[PDB]
């Protein structure tokens, strides 16, 4: 059973799939597609969208998975990272929802020239971004554990760190001296998962 | 127990919470907040965002739930509408993800001056809207049952009907003589759930 994570963007939507697998201690192969080869690769991907995950058993049979956060939730559920109670499940989804709202602001900046980019970044960093970071800070405070939901790793944790890194991609100093719970979350996450600590260092 | 669904909106994000409860045969109270009353209501809502769900027990204890699709997933999970196996769960999340991509196109048209709204409606209906509808059609085909995932109601079913109604909101004729599996899905869904059939007329 061989897992291939097929994607173009190293900083993209595959991050949540890769981090789930890393934290789960699961081997996989990264297959990165270049812009140049995409037109030729597209018709070979069911649904024609990346990221996608190709799973090949030892009899050469192929199962395809599409929709990156659906894949990540499947892999997370399989390896006990989607909450241990229905209440924890709710809170996992709550924080994923909140991080996706933040991610969607980051998305407004993508594929622009110098400006719109500069103009968008400025609008989002003064608008919804700080509101959303505050909401996430309070969700983290309300955890019954040291992590986003309880004390052990969930998808909510990995989705969060990926989205924060996009925020800092826009303004590296944006969270400096602020959102201590968010910095504290990352410290704590890296402690609970040497694997992810290792992966993120590399 | 007493469930209150607090929202704007209407044809908004509350639809998936309400449809889930309706399909689960769970009673609840709708509390609709006017634009005029929102400034005074906001500080009483944790996180200051709607939709939100206020749950009051017999002892007058108050539990708040936020993030509408996290709420919808909680309620769906509690009532066996999130798939019966891990593969069914992945497929529920797959279709939810696909419908939300469609929903995001619909969102580009909201709160616009009619000028650019007309321009946006025209832009998406020729762009990603039919691409996404085709993807959803193929997802429905791949179901092992008559509904989006298997033969029984899941959150994916309700998210799909809500989003398709938004598309027809933009162009009431867009799916006429097209996407037969989508028409077929809705045919089937109302059959499988007399409760929802009722709600969707009433």
UniProtKB/Swiss-Prot annotation, chains A, B:
- Enzymatic reactions: RX + glutathione = an S-substituted glutathione + a halide anion + H(+)
Q: What class of enzyme is it?
A: transferase
* Role description: Conjugation of reduced glutathione to a wide number of exogenous and endogenous hydrophobic electrophiles.
Asked if the keyword Transferase belongs to this entry, the reply reads yes
- A Gene Ontology BP annotation from the UniProt entry: glutathione metabolic process
Its recorded name reads Glutathione S-transferase class-mu 28 kDa isozyme
Location of the GST N-terminal domain: 1-83
**Residue span(s) of domain GST C-terminal:** 85-202
């Amino acid at each position: 059973d061989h897992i291939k994570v097929i994607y173009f963007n190293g900083r993209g939507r595959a991050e949540s799939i890769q981090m789930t697998l890393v934290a789960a201690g699961v081997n996989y192969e990264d297959e990165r597609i270049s812009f140049q080869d995409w037109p030729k690769i597209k018709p070979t991907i069911p649904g024609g969208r990346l990221p996608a995950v190709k799973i090949t058993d030892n009899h050469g049979h192929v199962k395809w998975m599409v929709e990156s956060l659906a894949i990540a939730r499947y892999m997370a559920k399989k390896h006990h990272m989607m909450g241990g109670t229905e209440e924890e499940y709710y809170n996992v989804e709550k924080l994923i929802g909140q991080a996706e709202d933040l991610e969607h602001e980051y998305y407004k900046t993508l594929m622009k020239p110098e400006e719109e980019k500069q103009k968008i970044i400025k609008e989002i960093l003064n608008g919804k971004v700080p509101v959303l970071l505050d909401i996430i800070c309070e969700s983290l405070k309300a955890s019954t554990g040291k992590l986003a939901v309880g004390d052990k790793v969930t998808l909510a944790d990995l989705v969060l760190i990926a989205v924060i890194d996009h925020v800092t991609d826009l303004d590296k100093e944006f969270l400096t001296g602020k959102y201590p719970e968010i910095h504290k979350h990352r410290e704590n996450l890296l402690a609970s998962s040497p694997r992810l600590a290792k992966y993120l260092s590399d």
